[PDB]
Design a protein around this ligand. Structure first.
Ligand code: ACO
Ligand code: ACO
Lengths: 179, 177
């Protein structure tokens, strides 16, 4: 139940249901303390980072995405494994999902260190729109590809989000099992 | 750089290079204060904490265990891939570690496991896990198949694959739960 008030603000996007503002390290102390508390609050589930925030019309902070510079990520790949049975049993074509993290470091630009959305405003495209803004705004004048972003230490929510967001059952990660 | 003092502790094994003791939720207030300070630096109720203390009196390893019902299998594979080098293509295999979505029953969750950096590769983590197997459920000796590891790090992955013997191991608080 945390709120946030302008003192300027810097809007990257406006919508029927709210706004996405960005906050940078150079911003007033008032902004830096709020990202902090929001950080702390999100942790229940610094240097050249950028923080995105989705603010409901209410002024309530309902989205947060913290992003950092990186050089490398590791691909996670959706596989669906065949279940083979004994020759005396009947055959079924149900596959079992598995998620495979490649050990090969592939090139990357933008590491999503944190990405959170308030439990009861989920599946409303908030996280998608935040990344969409991260992409247009991580580098001034560039539109990052889906592959230049990696997600730090995916939770299962993150996995299911990332996969659908990027298409093709793949996404890059870091702070994970291969590095 | 924490030191534990010999008191009358619950000692699970003695070794030439030190000992392993255990701290339970309802222990004396000293014990639980010490475990908490070991918790913090490591990270730079229904649980059990195992400490490896060297003859030097130093806290050299920490193992925090936990009850659980479910784990997910992680296994190394070589995935068919295409290597593309400006127009030119070849077929190859990429090493990857695969986590199955299938829940499997597990009893004991290694929520933390840690050995002080200078003391690694001296079988301290292996031993902590041995003390754990024969001190988790009374009158019972845990199978490797009944142990799972919380959110493994790359170090923990390299340890578990070898410690578990099969090239496979179970996890939780990971990408599938
Ligand atoms: C921190 C990291 O780097 S990764 C971990 C991310 N942080 C967390 O896990 C904290 C708790 N969870 C969350 O905050 C949220 O679940 C997030 C950030 C992962 C997703 O937030 P949302 O705003 O609900 O995602 P969004 O609406 O943009 O998702 C769009 C699509 O992604 C997929 N998706 C997102 N979350 C889920 C889910 N929990 N289960 C299944 N599919 C999902 C769906 O296809 C969804 O489309 P649909 O609703 O039309 O069927
Ligand atoms: C929180 C969790 O649940 S998982 C995360 C585990 N903890 C951490 O990541 C903290 C940092 N790392 C660690 O503290 C340690 O490396 C631990 C706890 C993973 C292992 O501690 P150790 O006492 O060095 O393990 P141990 O000595 O019993 O290793 C036995 C075998 O596992 C394998 N192994 C253990 N560490 C490694 C490694 N870093 N690289 C490659 N193989 C390894 C080796 O085969 C080793 O046998 P060997 O030395 O004869 O070749």
């Amino acid at each position: 139940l945390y709120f946030q008030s302008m003192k300027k603000e810097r809007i990257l996007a406006e919508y029927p249901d709210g706004r996405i503002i960005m906050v940078l390290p150079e911003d007033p102390k008032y902004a830096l303390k709020k990202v902090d508390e929001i950080r702390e609050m999100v942790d229940n589930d610094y240097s050249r980072t950028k923080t995105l925030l989705f603010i409901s019309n209410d002024k309530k902070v309902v989205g947060c995405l913290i992003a950092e510079h990186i050089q490398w990520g590791y691909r996670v790949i959706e596989e669906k494994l065949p279940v083979i049975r004994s020759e005396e049993e009947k055959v079924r074509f149900e596959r079992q999902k598995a998620w495979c993290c490649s050990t090969l470091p592939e090139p990357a630009i933008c590491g999503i260190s944190r990405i959170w959305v308030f439990s009861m405003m989920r599946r409303k495209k908030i996280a998608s729109r935040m990344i969409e803004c991260l992409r247009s705004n991580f580098i001034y004048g560039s539109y990052l590809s889906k592959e230049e972003i990696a997600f730090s230490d995916p939770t299962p929510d993150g996995k299911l989000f990332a996969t659908q967001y990027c298409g093709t059952g793949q996404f890059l990660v870091y702070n994970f099992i291969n590095g």
